[PDB]
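Onboarding guide, step 5: your first structure request.
Type a short instruction followed by the sequence, for example:

Predict the 3D structure of this protein.
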Amino acid sequence: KVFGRCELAAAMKRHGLDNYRGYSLGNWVCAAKFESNFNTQATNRNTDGSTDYGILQINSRWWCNDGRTPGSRNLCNIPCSALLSSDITASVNCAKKIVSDGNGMNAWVAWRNRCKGTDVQAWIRGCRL
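The system replies with structure tokens like these:
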């Protein structure tokens, strides 16, 4: 599924991401936009044998099990396939653990390169939240 911008904003706010750990909703929408362009089925294979899954491109080396990543850990206790669903619940819950893992949103490279320090409030424009 490909979310509309405000549609995703609403979904994320509904799952408690607005201001979570101090990160405004705009940050999450911006991260999602550049990580997967709002596509829940987005996948990116890495050169280390791991793969990034879903709307927030969660990595298989530590967060989910895709059964084909060496010395992988499954800290979010879920198959990576669950992160490709149209329902973002699984991705959001896992993301909440990731953002609290000692690096803030820096864990998402696209957020750091295209969102950090910008006027992220713009990503929420036109949304009736």
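Each response can be followed by summary notes, for example: The chain has one domain: 1-129.
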